[PDB]
Specification:
The structure is cut from a larger assembly and holds chains A (about 60 residues) and B (about 55 residues). By secondary structure, chain A is mainly alpha-helical. Helices cover about 55% and strands about 0% of the residues of chain A. The chains are: A mainly alpha (about 60), B mainly alpha (about 55). The PDB classes it as membrane protein.
Chain lengths: ~60, ~55
Amino acid sequence: FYNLYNFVRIGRVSKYVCWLSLPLVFQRMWMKNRATGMEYDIDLENYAPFEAKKNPMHGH
Amino acid sequence: DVPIEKIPEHANVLLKKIDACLEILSKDIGEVTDAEAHEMYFETSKFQILHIY
């Protein structure tokens, strides 16, 4: 790791830009946990399931 | 219309010319020593620069 970060030290732009995609990881970490237990309407889940098979409104 | 004795005068002229050329062309530009041209050689060292005073 010291070698990689010693090269990051010598970079000029990537060491100040490539980290701006990292907050997005924590965004996913938080939203996933929100979604693992999200309460939803049974009627809406039975009428519009997301990417479920054999839905004629999708085509198959 | 050109005698043979007049030749060494022409040779002297051309020697003067080529000597004026070669005295200039004998000079050459050495290696650059400006620190602004080589500061990135020190920026890219494996360790940070120590400003020691």
